Design a protein around this ligand. Structure first.
Ligand SMILES: [Cl-]
Ligand SMILES: [Cl-]
Ligand SMILES: [Mg+2]
Lengths: 383, 390
């Protein structure tokens, strides 16, 4: 007799319902990504896997708008690639500065504290962005080696302007690391042209691939910082000197990269390349304008008061006065099979979040969620 | 749409349809997938906090508890493939200055030693030649000498083709106030393991060896003694995202939930759930039997064609990954290429200390069959006939 018996719960067939995911992530998968999902396995070091890896690197270079050879995939979902960036870039005692205008800057600060950096934060209210003047004041005061700036603040629905920030940092002998998890593919970014030194994103937002892999790129200035270190990064597996070899970034090793995740990412990148970035950005702007018109018509208010900093991909809507937000979210799910979310970090209990991400950024999906919200407002209990 | 012109053009290579050839994967991993797991790869997405996902997470925990044979409530999934979960184990278990003991008999012990050095541990290694295992006497002498807080022991040494006996090691460690961490990445599902009954305090494995489950997630479990070491830390572990004191709350491992962001690789979980369902349906005993039978059959073929085992003692030969000494006069790359080119079968060379010294043949779950053994045996006999020899 075995200690632990076969779980009865596993004897039932796996079933996943069909829903429209209009929250902050994960997004619905595009047909090409769906098709990729049941492809057979091949060996990690085989000719065809090496070709798929090179095509993925080219695709990431295209979406990021970078020529950086140190551009690759790391395991992990959401914003966890910040750990890969920080573990490599920061040594104990290094001065680090964050744009803490939501949960992401705060999280970067927490990680940097854990590895022994001297952590400094420019704290702003949720719903605000950073000006060049504010960042220059932070650089002057703290003299950081690295600035962390969030492009798409998915906890607050904020899009951060990127022009001029990289060169401002360079004037202070500081590198610029950008988080574009919630913005990449939906908002204009030109990594090399904007002087961004390190950037990461995820597969599950605009890219419409399954969660679990992240995209990261380091320029040679950033690689120079890593090679100047007194000590090896705390993580062997996310050490850029190991990852670079694995991904053939220096003219290759043994490793277990996630094969099926690579097939899906390859297809997601192919779809963006075929549409072209300009069309992808226009499509998100167009979907968001239509959503913002419906929200205004329903009398719902925006959490972000300045229209110019509203993130096209994820909109923060102030919870309507008198309602329980959980009833609105549950009503939309039960009656329309649409997933929307509440808040995150500083916006917990304060907002609804609606995401219009890649394949889902259509005026048709906007009409579906607008209808669902209208019905929720007339039927959910009010005070 | 923005303030600059696009200067990196779309890659033309991405416009070609994505296809992959049909091959039999008999290397050290990944293995070919069972039809249910393949099918689970194309399932639709759902939200991370939704009722259906929470239920899948619950069934996965139960499934891991079953394959590990543990009642530990702190049993969950972490991101990362291969043996990466050793980082999650070591970042949580070791503080700067902690004495750490490793069974360095292949690449995995060397890897644990490196990671432990990176985090400021006082690292002590019991170095043995590739192809050997640790005796209870050897481990006791290491424990006595170094007084480690943690011993790292590799169950399935996939770089050398060695299976480590586990009976008595946990109990021995506890007499020296030491925790036992076991790596079962290459052995789980194919070799008998009884986590609680063998006194294993921490164990990890991954989903792409015997489990046949993409995309490459890790399974990990900590008992109460291991939890106590983690909560007694004077400093936070280096990773927030793999901090077990936060991940335990997320996964509902203590009754007191706090939805700290962390992660959920959804398609990953679907495939893992199905793989765990297949193993539970078949039963662990039958799974272990299938591996022994397939390996026995492979070993009989190898003996008959004159190939020599890298592991001298037959009882220490890992059923799931067999190491074969490269035969004298041949270029091992020619053998591996011949098997691929003429039979569409993937086998491998060595790893770490067995690089250039061995061939590796894996029989991992779904692929651990008689027909597959017969196929690789024919491919190997023909490679020995037709590859150039000195
Ligand atoms: Cl979907
Ligand atoms: Cl397959
Ligand atoms: Mg409309």
């Amino acid at each position: 007799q075995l200690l632990v018996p076969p779980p009865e719960a596993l004897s039932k067939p796996l079933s996943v319902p069909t829903r429209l995911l209009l929250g902050p992530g994960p997004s619905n998968l595009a047909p090409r990504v769906l098709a990729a999902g049941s492809l057979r396995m091949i060996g990690h070091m085989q000719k065809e896997m090496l070709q798929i890896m090179e095509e993925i690197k080219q695709g990431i270079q295209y979406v990021f708008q970078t020529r950086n050879p140190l551009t690759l995939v790391v395991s992990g979902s959401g914003h966890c690639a910040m750990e890969t960036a920080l573990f490599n870039l920061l040594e104990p005692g290094d001065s680090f500065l964050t744009g803490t205008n939501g949960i992401w800057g705060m999280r970067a600060a927490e990680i940097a504290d854990r590895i022994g950096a001297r952590v400094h934060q420019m704290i702003k209210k949720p719903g605000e962005h950073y000006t060049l003047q504010e960042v220059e004041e932070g650089l002057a005061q703290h003299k950081p080696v690295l600035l962390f700036l969030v492009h798409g603040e998915s906890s607050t629905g904020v899009v951060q302007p990127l022009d001029g920030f990289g060169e401002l940092c360079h004037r202070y002998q500081c590198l610029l690391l950008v988080d574009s998890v919630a913005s990449l593919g939906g908002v204009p970014i030109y990594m090399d042209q904007q002087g961004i030194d390190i950037m990461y994103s995820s597969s599950q937002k605009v890219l419409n691939a399954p969660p679990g892999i992240s995209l990261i790129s380091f320029n040679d200035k950033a690689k120079y910082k890593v090679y100047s270190r007194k000590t090896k990064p705390v993580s062997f597996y996310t050490d850029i000197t190991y990852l670079a070899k694995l991904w053939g970034c220096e003219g290759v090793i043994h490793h277990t990269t996630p094969v099926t995740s690579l097939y899906c990412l390859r297809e997601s990148l192919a779809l963006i390349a075929e549409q072209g970035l300009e069309n992808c950005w226009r499509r998100h702007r167009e979907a968001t304008a239509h959503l913002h018109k419906h929200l205004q018509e329903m009398g719902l208010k925006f959490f972000v008061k300045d229209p110019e900093i509203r993130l096209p991909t994820i909109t923060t809507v102030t919870v309507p006065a008198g309602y329980n937000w959980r009833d609105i979210v549950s009503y939309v799910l039960d009656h329309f099979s649409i997933e929307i979310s509440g808040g995150l970090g500083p916006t917990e209990e304060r907002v609804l979040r609606i995401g219009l991400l890649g394949y889902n950024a259509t005026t048709e999906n906007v009409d579906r969620v607008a209808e669902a919200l209208r019905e929720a407002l007339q039927h959910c209990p009010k005070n």
